[PDB]
Amino acid sequence: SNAMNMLKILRQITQEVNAAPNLEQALKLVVVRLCEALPADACSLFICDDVHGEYVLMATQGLNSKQVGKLRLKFGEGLIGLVGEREEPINLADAPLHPAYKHRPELGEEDYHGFLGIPIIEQGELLGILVIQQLESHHFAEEEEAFCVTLAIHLAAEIAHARAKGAL
Amino acid sequence: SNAMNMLKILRQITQEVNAAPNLEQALKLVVVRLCEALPADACSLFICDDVHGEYVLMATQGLNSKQVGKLRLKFGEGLIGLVGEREEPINLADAPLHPAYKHRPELGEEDYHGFLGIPIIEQGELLGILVIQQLESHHFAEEEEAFCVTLAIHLAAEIAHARAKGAL
Ligand code: NA
Ligand code: NA
Numbered sequence: 001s002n003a004m005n006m007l008k009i010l011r012q013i014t015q016e017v018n019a020a021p022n023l024e025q026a027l028k029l030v031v032v033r034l035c036e037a038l039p040a041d042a043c044s045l046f047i048c049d050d051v052h053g054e055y056v057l058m059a060t061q062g063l064n065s066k067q068v069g070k071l072r073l074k075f076g077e078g079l080i081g082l083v084g085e086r087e088e089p090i091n092l093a094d095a096p097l098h099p100a101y102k103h104r105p106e107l108g109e110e111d112y113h114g115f116l117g118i119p120i121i122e123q124g125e126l127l128g129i130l131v132i133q134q135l136e137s138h139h140f141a142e143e144e145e146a147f148c149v150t151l152a153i154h155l156a157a158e159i160a161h162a163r164a165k166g167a168l
Numbered sequence: 169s170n171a172m173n174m175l176k177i178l179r180q181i182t183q184e185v186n187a188a189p190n191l192e193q194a195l196k197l198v199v200v201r202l203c204e205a206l207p208a209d210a211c212s213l214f215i216c217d218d219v220h221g222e223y224v225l226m227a228t229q230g231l232n233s234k235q236v237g238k239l240r241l242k243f244g245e246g247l248i249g250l251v252g253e254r255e256e257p258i259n260l261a262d263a264p265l266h267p268a269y270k271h272r273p274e275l276g277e278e279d280y281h282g283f284l285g286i287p288i289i290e291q292g293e294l295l296g297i298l299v300i301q302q303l304e305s306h307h308f309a310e311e312e313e314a315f316c317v318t319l320a321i322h323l324a325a326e327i328a329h330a331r332a333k334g335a336l
Pocket of ligand 1: 074075076077080081082083084085
């Protein structure tokens with residue numbers, strides 16, 4: 001178990017997020033840091049676009065960078081949609097085997113298996129989704145999930161603040 | 169070692185702080201939660217009053233509640249002053265034995281020994297001090313310090329935000 005590491009990683013990243021000059025920088029910092037520190041092979045952050053009923057990719061490490069600001073996933077659909085509707089984490093060892101998973105080989109991404117999807121919720125309002133993936137067919141351990149969930153609370157506040165300032 | 173607990177406590181308190189309706193409520197929540205969860209016997213939060221060059225007590229669990237908003241300590245003085253000037257944590261098993269400690273028996277508080285003083289710093293600017301005390305003559309373990317430091321980053325942001333909104 002690596003809970004002590006998680007704690008110090010949280011310390012460093014909480015520091016870096018609060019020092020970030022804007023929301024975009026905070027999000028981009030997080031996906032990179034998570035992959036480096038957990039470690040994990042991909043990390044993506046989606047923000048809700050309530051008018052169009054879609055999640056929009058807003059930061060990624062591991063995925064095609066051009067998809068940032070462009071990749072849209074419909075509310076309620078797929079595994080990521082399921083995370084959003086449950087408003088609970090989904091932690092799996094082999095995501096592609098889940099009945100809700102939508103396989104998109106055309107996108108030319110790596111073959112991930114391990115999956116941790118975490119709802120980003122501000123006082124009961126879903127604002128986005130944090131998605132962590134790895135090549136190994138392993139779920140994420142307890143301290144990893146706790147770390148990511150605790151982090152998502154911070155991300156929710158940062159997104160809410162950006163929205164409240166008209167920065168989105 | 170109780171790092172896994174710290175991680176989940178952080179999860180719950182980070183949640184509660186972000187859900188707090190104002191700064192005062194966040195601060196009061198923190199001092200109570202820290203004492204319950206670590207556990208510790210007293211926890212106090214001071215905010216810098218730069219005009220008068222004093223730390224002002226703004227929340228406490230364990231100390232005389234009437235001192236809140238009233239107790240003032242001069243910059244640079246005593247152990248708490250030393251935490252502020254070092255901008256580093258001071259973690260001791262027996263605070264009263266430290267050369268910088270100022271004993272105030274007249275205040276009628278409990279005889280604490282273990283001491284963790286943590287600077288609350290927002291992007292290099294000292295905003296306050298978090299002080300955790302216990303009756304046992306034990307310093308605070310690594311996960312306890314990491315927990316409290318990580319928390320203080322959150323507190324710094326909350327104080328900075330309140331100041332920026334004119335709420336202080
Ligand atoms: Na959804
Ligand atoms: Na000082």
